[PDB]
Design an enzyme around this catalytic site. Structure first.
Site, PDB file in Angstrom:
ATOM      1  N   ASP A 199      -6.840 -13.266  -0.325  1.00  0.00           N
ATOM      2  CA  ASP A 199      -8.198 -12.446  -0.599  1.00  0.00           C
ATOM      3  C   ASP A 199      -8.223 -11.581  -1.897  1.00  0.00           C
ATOM      4  OD1 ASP A 199      -5.811 -10.805  -0.013  1.00  0.00           O
ATOM      5  OD2 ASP A 199      -6.948  -9.474   1.504  1.00  0.00           O
ATOM      6  N   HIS A 200      -7.273 -11.791  -2.705  1.00  0.00           N
ATOM      7  CA  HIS A 200      -7.352 -11.286  -4.076  1.00  0.00           C
ATOM      8  C   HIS A 200      -6.242 -11.705  -4.985  1.00  0.00           C
ATOM      9  CE1 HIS A 200      -4.009  -8.756  -2.177  1.00  0.00           C
ATOM     10  NE2 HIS A 200      -5.107  -8.064  -1.428  1.00  0.00           N
ATOM     11  N   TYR A 241     -14.411  -7.556  -3.493  1.00  0.00           N
ATOM     12  CA  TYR A 241     -15.115  -8.125  -2.254  1.00  0.00           C
ATOM     13  C   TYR A 241     -16.634  -8.056  -2.395  1.00  0.00           C
ATOM     14  CZ  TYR A 241     -10.633  -7.420  -0.165  1.00  0.00           C
ATOM     15  OH  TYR A 241      -9.234  -7.602   0.069  1.00  0.00           O
ATOM     16  N   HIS A 271       0.826  -1.168   0.016  1.00  0.00           N
ATOM     17  CA  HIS A 271      -0.006  -0.130   0.060  1.00  0.00           C
ATOM     18  C   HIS A 271       0.781   1.411   0.112  1.00  0.00           C
ATOM     19  CE1 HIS A 271      -4.028  -1.745   0.809  1.00  0.00           C
ATOM     20  NE2 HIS A 271      -3.258  -2.960   1.046  1.00  0.00           N
ATOM     21  N   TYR A 274     -13.179 -25.442  -9.159  1.00  0.00           N
ATOM     22  CA  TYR A 274     -12.554 -26.763  -8.535  1.00  0.00           C
ATOM     23  C   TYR A 274     -11.744 -26.147  -7.366  1.00  0.00           C
ATOM     24  CZ  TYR A 274     -14.306 -30.452 -11.456  1.00  0.00           C
ATOM     25  OH  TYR A 274     -15.007 -31.269 -12.339  1.00  0.00           O
TER      26      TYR A 274
HETATM   27  C1  ISW Z   1     -17.523 -29.052 -12.746  1.00  0.00           C
HETATM   28  C2  ISW Z   1     -18.469 -29.443 -11.935  1.00  0.00           C
HETATM   29  C3  ISW Z   1     -16.878 -30.180 -13.486  1.00  0.00           C
HETATM   30  C4  ISW Z   1     -17.276 -31.086 -14.453  1.00  0.00           C
HETATM   31  C5  ISW Z   1     -18.874 -31.692 -14.610  1.00  0.00           C
HETATM   32  C6  ISW Z   1     -16.105 -31.747 -15.005  1.00  0.00           C
HETATM   33  N1  ISW Z   1     -15.229 -31.264 -14.766  1.00  0.00           N
HETATM   34 FE1  ISW Z   1     -13.312 -31.903 -15.549  1.00  0.00          FE
HETATM   35  N2  ISW Z   1     -11.615 -32.552 -15.867  1.00  0.00           N
HETATM   36  C7  ISW Z   1     -10.957 -33.768 -15.712  1.00  0.00           C
HETATM   37  C8  ISW Z   1     -11.721 -35.230 -14.898  1.00  0.00           C
HETATM   38  C9  ISW Z   1     -13.437 -34.721 -15.384  1.00  0.00           C
HETATM   39  C10 ISW Z   1     -14.149 -36.024 -15.576  1.00  0.00           C
HETATM   40  C11 ISW Z   1     -13.499 -37.448 -15.412  1.00  0.00           C
HETATM   41  C12 ISW Z   1     -12.983 -38.482 -16.725  1.00  0.00           C
HETATM   42  C13 ISW Z   1     -14.263 -38.770 -17.285  1.00  0.00           C
HETATM   43  O1  ISW Z   1     -15.466 -38.965 -16.785  1.00  0.00           O
HETATM   44  O2  ISW Z   1     -14.185 -38.636 -18.595  1.00  0.00           O
HETATM   45  C14 ISW Z   1     -15.210 -35.641 -15.823  1.00  0.00           C
HETATM   46  C15 ISW Z   1     -16.797 -35.920 -16.163  1.00  0.00           C
HETATM   47  C16 ISW Z   1     -15.260 -33.996 -15.892  1.00  0.00           C
HETATM   48  N3  ISW Z   1     -13.975 -33.576 -15.516  1.00  0.00           N
HETATM   49  C17 ISW Z   1     -16.423 -33.175 -16.042  1.00  0.00           C
HETATM   50  C18 ISW Z   1      -9.524 -33.892 -16.196  1.00  0.00           C
HETATM   51  C19 ISW Z   1      -8.607 -35.267 -16.215  1.00  0.00           C
HETATM   52  C20 ISW Z   1      -7.431 -34.930 -15.093  1.00  0.00           C
HETATM   53  C21 ISW Z   1      -6.403 -36.025 -15.708  1.00  0.00           C
HETATM   54  O3  ISW Z   1      -5.223 -35.535 -15.816  1.00  0.00           O
HETATM   55  O4  ISW Z   1      -6.644 -37.166 -16.316  1.00  0.00           O
HETATM   56  C22 ISW Z   1      -9.397 -32.674 -16.757  1.00  0.00           C
HETATM   57  C23 ISW Z   1      -8.045 -32.042 -17.448  1.00  0.00           C
HETATM   58  C24 ISW Z   1     -10.509 -31.799 -16.607  1.00  0.00           C
HETATM   59  C25 ISW Z   1     -10.778 -30.105 -17.287  1.00  0.00           C
HETATM   60  C26 ISW Z   1     -11.796 -29.559 -15.863  1.00  0.00           C
HETATM   61  C27 ISW Z   1     -11.511 -27.900 -15.671  1.00  0.00           C
HETATM   62  C28 ISW Z   1     -10.316 -27.135 -16.109  1.00  0.00           C
HETATM   63  C29 ISW Z   1      -9.542 -26.426 -15.241  1.00  0.00           C
HETATM   64  C30 ISW Z   1     -12.557 -27.675 -14.667  1.00  0.00           C
HETATM   65  C31 ISW Z   1     -12.776 -26.594 -14.032  1.00  0.00           C
HETATM   66  C32 ISW Z   1     -13.376 -28.971 -14.355  1.00  0.00           C
HETATM   67  N4  ISW Z   1     -12.757 -30.098 -15.342  1.00  0.00           N
HETATM   68  C33 ISW Z   1     -14.447 -29.279 -13.287  1.00  0.00           C
HETATM   69  C34 ISW Z   1     -15.294 -30.314 -13.605  1.00  0.00           C
HETATM   70  C1  ISW Z   2      -2.617  -6.120   6.590  1.00  0.00           C
HETATM   71  C2  ISW Z   2      -3.238  -6.243   7.742  1.00  0.00           C
HETATM   72  C3  ISW Z   2      -3.314  -5.364   5.420  1.00  0.00           C
HETATM   73  C4  ISW Z   2      -3.886  -3.902   5.401  1.00  0.00           C
HETATM   74  C5  ISW Z   2      -3.926  -3.042   6.950  1.00  0.00           C
HETATM   75  C6  ISW Z   2      -4.466  -3.724   4.234  1.00  0.00           C
HETATM   76  N1  ISW Z   2      -4.055  -4.747   3.333  1.00  0.00           N
HETATM   77 FE1  ISW Z   2      -4.561  -4.676   1.484  1.00  0.00          FE
HETATM   78  N2  ISW Z   2      -5.021  -4.671  -0.299  1.00  0.00           N
HETATM   79  C7  ISW Z   2      -6.348  -4.591  -0.902  1.00  0.00           C
HETATM   80  C8  ISW Z   2      -8.049  -4.459  -0.196  1.00  0.00           C
HETATM   81  C9  ISW Z   2      -7.374  -3.528   1.239  1.00  0.00           C
HETATM   82  C10 ISW Z   2      -8.456  -2.465   1.578  1.00  0.00           C
HETATM   83  C11 ISW Z   2      -9.795  -2.328   0.870  1.00  0.00           C
HETATM   84  C12 ISW Z   2     -10.269  -1.327   0.129  1.00  0.00           C
HETATM   85  C13 ISW Z   2     -10.466  -0.173   1.073  1.00  0.00           C
HETATM   86  O1  ISW Z   2     -11.032   0.089   2.112  1.00  0.00           O
HETATM   87  O2  ISW Z   2      -9.913   1.047   0.675  1.00  0.00           O
HETATM   88  C14 ISW Z   2      -7.512  -1.957   2.592  1.00  0.00           C
HETATM   89  C15 ISW Z   2      -7.868  -1.216   3.967  1.00  0.00           C
HETATM   90  C16 ISW Z   2      -6.283  -2.734   2.759  1.00  0.00           C
HETATM   91  N3  ISW Z   2      -6.212  -3.791   1.956  1.00  0.00           N
HETATM   92  C17 ISW Z   2      -5.253  -2.401   3.982  1.00  0.00           C
HETATM   93  C18 ISW Z   2      -6.538  -4.762  -2.561  1.00  0.00           C
HETATM   94  C19 ISW Z   2      -7.681  -4.715  -3.376  1.00  0.00           C
HETATM   95  C20 ISW Z   2      -8.162  -6.033  -4.125  1.00  0.00           C
HETATM   96  C21 ISW Z   2      -8.892  -5.921  -5.398  1.00  0.00           C
HETATM   97  O3  ISW Z   2      -8.807  -6.594  -6.365  1.00  0.00           O
HETATM   98  O4  ISW Z   2      -9.514  -4.782  -5.458  1.00  0.00           O
HETATM   99  C22 ISW Z   2      -4.921  -4.970  -2.950  1.00  0.00           C
HETATM  100  C23 ISW Z   2      -4.416  -4.928  -4.372  1.00  0.00           C
HETATM  101  C24 ISW Z   2      -4.263  -5.014  -1.589  1.00  0.00           C
HETATM  102  C25 ISW Z   2      -2.582  -4.974  -1.540  1.00  0.00           C
HETATM  103  C26 ISW Z   2      -2.464  -5.817  -0.006  1.00  0.00           C
HETATM  104  C27 ISW Z   2      -1.137  -6.555   0.160  1.00  0.00           C
HETATM  105  C28 ISW Z   2      -0.182  -6.957  -0.919  1.00  0.00           C
HETATM  106  C29 ISW Z   2       0.130  -8.227  -1.494  1.00  0.00           C
HETATM  107  C30 ISW Z   2      -1.284  -6.945   1.529  1.00  0.00           C
HETATM  108  C31 ISW Z   2      -0.124  -8.124   1.970  1.00  0.00           C
HETATM  109  C32 ISW Z   2      -2.376  -6.761   2.137  1.00  0.00           C
HETATM  110  N4  ISW Z   2      -3.021  -5.655   1.267  1.00  0.00           N
HETATM  111  C33 ISW Z   2      -2.726  -6.756   3.682  1.00  0.00           C
HETATM  112  C34 ISW Z   2      -3.753  -5.913   4.181  1.00  0.00           C
HETATM  113  O1  JUG Z   3      -9.636  -5.626   3.269  1.00  0.00           O
HETATM  114  C1  JUG Z   3     -10.687  -5.406   3.563  1.00  0.00           C
HETATM  115  C2  JUG Z   3     -11.820  -5.745   2.631  1.00  0.00           C
HETATM  116  C3  JUG Z   3     -13.272  -5.495   3.092  1.00  0.00           C
HETATM  117  C4  JUG Z   3     -13.517  -4.741   4.239  1.00  0.00           C
HETATM  118  O2  JUG Z   3     -14.787  -4.434   4.644  1.00  0.00           O
HETATM  119  C5  JUG Z   3     -12.424  -3.999   5.038  1.00  0.00           C
HETATM  120  C6  JUG Z   3     -12.657  -3.210   6.287  1.00  0.00           C
HETATM  121  O3  JUG Z   3     -13.949  -2.971   6.542  1.00  0.00           O
HETATM  122  C7  JUG Z   3     -11.614  -2.674   6.881  1.00  0.00           C
HETATM  123  C8  JUG Z   3     -10.286  -2.950   6.408  1.00  0.00           C
HETATM  124  C9  JUG Z   3     -10.079  -3.858   5.387  1.00  0.00           C
HETATM  125  C10 JUG Z   3     -10.941  -4.511   4.524  1.00  0.00           C
END
Ligand code: ISW
Ligand code: ISW
Ligand code: JUG
Ligand code: HEC
Ligand code: HEC
Ligand code: HEC
Ligand code: HEC
Ligand code: HEC
Ligand code: ISW
Ligand code: JUG
Lengths: 56, 503, 503, 503, 56, 56
Positions: C267-268, C334, C233, C467
């Site tokens: 968280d992001h 969020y 930040h 998943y």
């Molecule tokens: C969400 C609920 C999803 C459904 C309905 C779905 N996938 Fe997938 N996926 C792999 C294994 C399978 C299978 C099993 C084998 C078969 O029955 O033929 C089914 C029915 C299925 N998914 C439907 C594999 C195999 C892993 C390997 O190394 O052999 C994948 C590669 C694969 C892609 C996939 C993704 C992509 C990231 C997601 C989000 C899902 N599946 C969710 C899931």
């Molecule tokens: C540790 C305890 C940390 C504090 C006090 C802090 N961050 Fe962060 N961060 C994001 C969201 C926020 C917010 C929310 C919005 C707002 O109220 O203005 C606050 C106050 C806050 N952090 C302070 C986001 C937004 C995510 C998005 O996709 O919109 C970031 C990007 C972000 C960087 C960050 C990091 C870097 C990796 C870490 C370690 C922390 N924050 C911890 C946290």
């Molecule tokens: O990082 C935050 C995400 C949601 C939120 O409500 C929040 C907050 O209320 C005060 C500090 C940080 C956050």
């Protein structure tokens, strides 16, 4: 047809007994009892696998 | 004949290899490809789910229709002109693509390593001439928008409200019959001896069929969540998941990053395991020294590649590289599937084991290759036995009815799913105590941790099956299952003494 | 006038666009920038925390003072010579930077795609003359160490114990007034219609203010832990978080890796979701084929970019690329924030939704773009409802006082925090049963899992909301919350029968 | 004499630095290296474990024997010809290696940045002449297969079933005595003042010894799982884990990806922490702008490197880069080890802290360097104190015997391990309620979460010790430990009232 | 002013009922009861949303 | 062998270095009664010195 089920502990004892005499004894790859690895006689695990293969 | 297509494909299509022409072979492939009996359409449970907006792109042959706007007619060049400002990058990416520069392939000399594309260019024309799409001497000038999205080599007007289509796999197969037949051959080569998986699965040829035939995918109301699974299961429908649109770079598909979006996650972390391996980290360090444009057969010689990639390891079979990635599958990622472990010692698996050793012996020695592959098999079984011991504890409670809320708050899954123990539906649907914590913990112990353990073993990432993934989390799952089981036994023993004082 | 600065910025500064000079506009920006009422200083809870050693670099305008050693005086050239071995890379990196080679920009011809840097060079010189930093006939020679760390275009000696400063945003804004005004415009463009977030937040202009205005950040004793949040930040204080010191490469800031250190985590997970997407994996495969030195406006045409990056998607608004990244925010990462979900259908969100579609239509079609954005909105709401049902269960127990140790061992959070249910403080502070396991699990279900679900939806990673992340963990959290709730219900019913036997 | 070897190494070997020749120093190194008393062999628990197939490659000097097939004798050229078709890539990778092109090193001019390799080539020949491996006028022609796998500079036939060996560390040290002596110096430089760790550990010189001396590694039956740990602990045996076979590229070992396979995971996420840091993301964006072939001493000047890498930070000591990575260790990754925290303020640790500042001052200033290193030390203690409070809760239950199943179902660990509380064996072995959930959760709270917290602090990844890793998970572990402790106390108090009603 | 709170299941049923007649019946996007997806009449969800729009 | 010292005491010792024995600093880890525990430097330094004499 569908193949008869065999537990993974039995598959490992079967794989560990390949190219070995039936009287040889090897350590299980997964089982531990009384603070020691369970010893498996190779004649028994091969018999346990073949008795499941004949049911297929 | 296509020399890279197995005998089982022609046998299943009732065709003779010698006399089958490119047109005749293509028509036989499309017949089974678009047949609802072979997986096409909305599937057997299509009456339980309806498509969403994005679904017309995931399954075009079932849901897609051209947009009502604009209501204009266009020729070949009119696609490039109007879309030069409507989809500017789509036009600019198509211009660099090989599809728009076919004369750049003909003027390549025989000494340039990319000469093999000319043979495919003539083969692509060879497949089209058999279908009557161009003259026997007429050369294909370009592959424009009207070719893929309307009709191959179209010379007349096309209606933007009636003739626009999404290029599916068969649309790509009209020209690339070789690669389309190789992928469709997965329906015929991937046949398990004891029926561990459905025939032709797991494969890119039936990934959409498997997706829509999953009970939870059709039963759950969160269609936008379930359609996320569809985005990883679109290889059956379209062929732009590795060489993406509209560059369609073959060098892009050979890189490991092309498989990352789908083959990565909690149930199959192939991308995570390979990259963290020595094989993958070498691919990240030497990707600037390798010529990715050369084909996989020449990648180790003419490409300067010294580390294996996803396309090199998985598309190879007996020295030939094809779009069939099933002819060496033995474990199929999920070791807990009944019959998978028991089949690992069969001659069917041993033949595919020798096919894997042939892939590794291109670099390692046969002694070294078989030394680690034996570790992969035994290491996978060691994890499998760990889950089987923990599952026996939770399965005992299920039959005893002692699971948390099993008899009080366990609603039925959405139709057409039947209630059960440790079912896949409980991974994407939950209500009340269905599933229970122990029930879900042991399910994920096999579905997620045991799978990632085997993936780490298959893709040489030592932490992938020891500390970080696999044996690590499975140990924690085993401990917490034993802990909750002993806790619930103590709670049952405590409750039994309360019933004694009241009776 | 700066045509890339919205009207709300000049209106908030009480300035006229036509008559405002670069000197007057800079002073008005710094006035609000350094005003403690607008977020500057230690914040409203500054009396609860004290800075540490690294804090002088995280918030220089509040804590930084020059070091007592060395006690040497130096000219401009003496900065490069002595630091050539005291901080060798900082000197060697600055020489490689454009800041040390300003005459190298003047010889760029109009045919070179990097000619726009010359217009910015003259714009920088034009702004410095308005502030009285050099004569109208004197040309800017270089941007040396004495310029950023002491005073812009200094011609005399400088004391290393008195004049050394850490270049903050206003120090960079002395020359780059355009980019500094665009970043400061986030205070004025990011205004939520129903006050879902504080005005000007979330934004890079108030990221440090948001950090110091976080109750747990000031209350917790682990200052080294809380200062880690500060490191993500610091965009408000310094401007070297995307184009790092001392190369300050514009090509570096356009790359996705520049946003990875901050926009990544439980968280992001924007970095994890984007890279695993097809857009990110394409950026990893084609980063050698793209010209990163070209600006974002010409990156898709003259840069050869065919895949979107973080800078391309978020810094674009209605066809122009500015340092303001807030004019298209709708969900704000969020989804559980009150008013965010109910506002997603408002005309305010629909206008920003059309602005996002304009970004997508540069490659995809409007039908395809809106088809997935509808999936992102409904998928985020589908996940949100999953948390809302689980949050109702844990919140039900909190008001009933039935949480574990809520009435026996629940100490108050560190001042000035008030005790509550599922507060952000419980993520970085814990003592006794404050928070409880269910309370923290459902808190993380929204703060971490639900947030990562939307991130996966917004950055097309299908596994990012199915998943691996999002729906996967949310399903497990729902199961474990229901399981513990039923267990504690059974435990309470068993305890009630013990009280019955005792009465 | 080797100028890069510390005095403690020669003193431990009873040698005088000035007059000792490369032959005399090499024999003294191999004597201790192959001595079973100094860690060689199967270790103290060798009677409890047996090697597997891959183990002949993991520890060749103990298990390796040449393969029975083929039964042919071969010269130097016969290695290249037959393996050009048996392991074709192994031949093609060796041909590209510097080992096969030694005349390319002799003709290097003084202006080439790689001129330093000629001095090492002459030093390699100088070491061999002292050992009698080549003529006083004969130049080293090549480094072929017969040199590493049979005998250095062999001129006659070799039997493939008797003379083939796996090149261990001493095999590499015959020519590269400098790098072999630098690595072996870790046995003598890494000496903890209070014996917090065994002498010479942690180090790459005793990583295999530490692996086989781990009680759980020899006790557990899952040899394929335990051998995965061995694959990350093979630096002691072989030297191809950073510069891999058979290219053996020095530029490859300098890249951060070479260390990723081993230094990554749940107990030491050095790869994850570094990459997500600004240092790592800059290395991914600027790896095409750096000349990796130049040595580490010239990487910042002649290589154009502006971001630190693993080899740059850890192989550096007082301005010199050696294969010894132990002379700057202070925390040793595991903050919970007794004596580590109390030693962080000693003059021994403070001296190594000053040695790190010298590494940081290559870019940053000493004030900035000490400002963050102060955060790393204090931040590490803040995390350690969080675990110590949670461990006191679980340790109280263990001593009280109130752990789940501690007195009913807690079987003994496999021999030769004795039962204990929170032991490392419980991470890779579990049976019944041994370990318990609380016992394993607090163990992982330190072994995994606290360790990854310090790694995030040591490798500037802010999310690595705040939200995602470190303080985040430690907070959850602290909460869940407190929750289960309150639950079991209430359950114990409820059970006590049941015994009261029965008495 | 502050916007009236609306549950995510109601937001989804409202979006599924946009450009639909009040008598139309759509599937819920999140609710499952008695082993079937809950059907929501569009007249009821729009009435619940409109009563929240007037309270803003 | 080195004498054991808790991490909270190590942090309070580092905060009291170059400080007067009567100075009071905030603990880096301890919180009691909703406030950070204040530690007098005379007590923490005395606790460290009694541990240093039991070391070797
Ligand atoms: C969400 C609920 C999803 C459904 C309905 C779905 N996938 Fe997938 N996926 C792999 C294994 C399978 C299978 C099993 C084998 C078969 O029955 O033929 C089914 C029915 C299925 N998914 C439907 C594999 C195999 C892993 C390997 O190394 O052999 C994948 C590669 C694969 C892609 C996939 C993704 C992509 C990231 C997601 C989000 C899902 N599946 C969710 C899931
Ligand atoms: C540790 C305890 C940390 C504090 C006090 C802090 N961050 Fe962060 N961060 C994001 C969201 C926020 C917010 C929310 C919005 C707002 O109220 O203005 C606050 C106050 C806050 N952090 C302070 C986001 C937004 C995510 C998005 O996709 O919109 C970031 C990007 C972000 C960087 C960050 C990091 C870097 C990796 C870490 C370690 C922390 N924050 C911890 C946290
Ligand atoms: O990082 C935050 C995400 C949601 C939120 O409500 C929040 C907050 O209320 C005060 C500090 C940080 C956050
Ligand atoms: C006839 C009009 C074709 C259609 C329909 C498809 N492709 Fe094609 N494409 C065609 C030719 C003659 C060529 C060049 C010769 C060759 O085979 O290389 C191509 C090029 C490609 C490439 C090569 C990329 C490279 O780096 O050279 C790929 C990866 C590719 N095409 C993919 C592809 C896909 C996915 C298709 C279905 C949407 C498809 N093509 C259809 C001819 C024709
Ligand atoms: C006047 C002394 C300046 C100060 C103070 C800062 N910058 Fe600068 N910078 C200046 C000029 C005249 C130029 C060249 C014209 C241009 O294209 O801007 C630059 C250049 C940059 C760049 C681009 C470098 C490239 O190779 O493309 C960046 C990213 C940049 N400057 C950023 C930057 C930051 C973060 C500053 C605060 C530390 C800063 N500049 C101050 C002049 C001056
Ligand atoms: C991450 C959100 C950034 C912050 C914080 C700052 N800058 Fe930036 N800058 C960033 C990107 C992605 C780009 C590329 C813009 C493009 O069209 O390609 C830039 C660009 C600049 C430039 C232009 C230099 C050039 O293109 O030659 C300058 C002068 C610049 N940035 C300066 C600057 C200042 C002064 C900042 C603090 C107010 C600042 N940057 C912060 C990304 C980010
Ligand atoms: C186009 C595919 C994008 C890419 C490339 C990147 N982001 Fe993104 N982002 C995009 C969308 C469509 C959304 C949600 C829109 C909405 O209705 O809210 C987001 C969201 C974010 C946010 C929150 C701000 C917001 O506008 O919602 C952040 C902070 C964010 N994304 C970060 C981010 C990073 C770090 C990226 C590079 C790894 C990145 N985005 C790329 C679209 C796209
Ligand atoms: C004598 C036959 C040698 C044996 C045994 C080993 N190496 Fe070697 N190697 C040798 C020479 C004369 C050179 C020339 C370059 C140099 O720096 O001396 C090399 C080269 C290397 C390199 C650097 C290659 C590069 O391109 O920079 C490395 C990293 C290397 N060698 C490692 C190495 C290992 C791991 C060995 C044991 C298997 C080994 N060498 C043995 C000569 C000889
Ligand atoms: C499997 C059960 C494993 C054993 C038997 C084993 N490792 Fe490892 N490993 C590291 C820390 C150790 C130690 C500790 C110090 C010592 O005693 O010398 C031992 C005995 C050991 N491992 C044997 C570290 C240190 C982290 C740091 O930053 O200091 C490593 C780096 C390391 C590699 C490693 C891997 C590779 C990924 C794996 C799978 C294991 N170890 C498993 C574990
Ligand atoms: O993803 C799956 C892995 C194994 C399996 O058996 C399964 C299944 O039976 C139904 C849907 C998905 C799966």
């Amino acid at each position: 047809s569908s193949l008869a089920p065999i537990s993974a502990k039995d598959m490992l004892d079967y794989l560990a007994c390949k190219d070995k005499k039936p009287t040889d004894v090897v350590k299980s790859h997964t089982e531990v009892e009384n603070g020691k690895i369970v010893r498996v006689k190779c004649g028994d695990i091969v018999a346990l696998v073949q008795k499941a293969r004949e049911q297929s | 004949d296509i020399s890279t297509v197995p005998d089982e494909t022609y046998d299943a299509l009732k065709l003779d290899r010698g006399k089958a022409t490119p047109k005749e072979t293509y028509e036989a492939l499309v017949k089974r490809y678009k047949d609802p009996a072979h997986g096409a359409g909305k599937g057997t449970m299509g009456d339980y789910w309806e498509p969403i907006a994005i679904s017309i792109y995931m399954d075009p042959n079932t849901f897609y229709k051209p947009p009502v706007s604009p209501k204009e007619v266009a020729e070949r060049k009119d696609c490039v002109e109007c879309h030069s400002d409507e989809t500017p990058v789509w036009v600019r990416a198509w211009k660099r693509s090989t599809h728009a520069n076919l004369d750049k392939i003909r003027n390549l000399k025989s000494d340039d390593p990319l000469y093999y594309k000319k043979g495919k260019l003539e083969e692509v024309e060879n497949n089209l001439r058999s279908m009557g799409k161009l003259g026997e001497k007429e050369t294909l000038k370009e592959v424009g928008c009207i070719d893929c999205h309307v009709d191959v080599n179209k010379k007349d007007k096309a209606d933007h409200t009636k003739d626009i289509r999404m290029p599916t796999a068969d649309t790509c197969g009209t020209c690339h019959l070789r690669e389309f037949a190789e992928r469709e051959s997965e329906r015929d080569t991937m046949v398990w001896p004891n029926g561990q998986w459905p025939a032709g699965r797991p494969s890119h040829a039936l990934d959409y069929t498997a997706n829509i035939e999953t009970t939870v995918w059709a039963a759950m109301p969160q269609r936008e969540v379930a359609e996320g699974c569809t985005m990883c299961h679109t290889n059956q429908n379209k062929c732009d998941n590795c060489h993406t649109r509209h560059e369609f770079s073959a060098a892009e598909s050979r890189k490991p990053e092309a498989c990352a979006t789908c083959h990565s996650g909690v149930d199959h972390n192939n991308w995570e395991a390979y990259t963290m391996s020595k094989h993958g980290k070498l691919a990240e360090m030497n990707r600037d020294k390798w010529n990715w444009e050369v084909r996989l057969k020449d990648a180790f010689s003419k490409g300067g590649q010294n580390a294996p990639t996803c396309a090199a390891c998985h598309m190879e079979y007996e020295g030939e590289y094809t779009h069939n990635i099933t002819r060496k599958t033995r474990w199929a990622n999920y070791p807990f599937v009944p019959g998978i472990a028991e089949n690992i010692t069969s001659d069917w698996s041993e033949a595919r084991l020798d096919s894997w050793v042939l892939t590794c012996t291109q670099c390692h020695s046969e002694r070294f290759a078989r030394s680690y592959l034996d570790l992969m098999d035994k290491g996978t079984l060691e994890g499998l036995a760990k889950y089987q011991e923990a599952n026996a504890i939770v399965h005992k409670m299920y039959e005893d009815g002692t699971l948390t809320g099993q008899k009080t708050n366990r609603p039925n899954p959405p139709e057409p799913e039947k209630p059960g123990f440790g079912i896949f539906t409980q991974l994407f649907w939950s209500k009340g105590n269905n599933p229970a914590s122990l029930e879900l913990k042991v399910l994920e112990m096999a579905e997620n941790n045991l799978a990632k353990m085997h993936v780490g073993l298959a893709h040489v990432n030592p932490g992938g099956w020891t500390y970080t993934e696999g044996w690590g989390p499975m140990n924690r799952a085993y401990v917490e299952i034993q802990d909750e089981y002993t806790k619930m036994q103590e709670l049952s023993a405590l409750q039994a003494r309360v019933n004694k004082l009241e009776g």
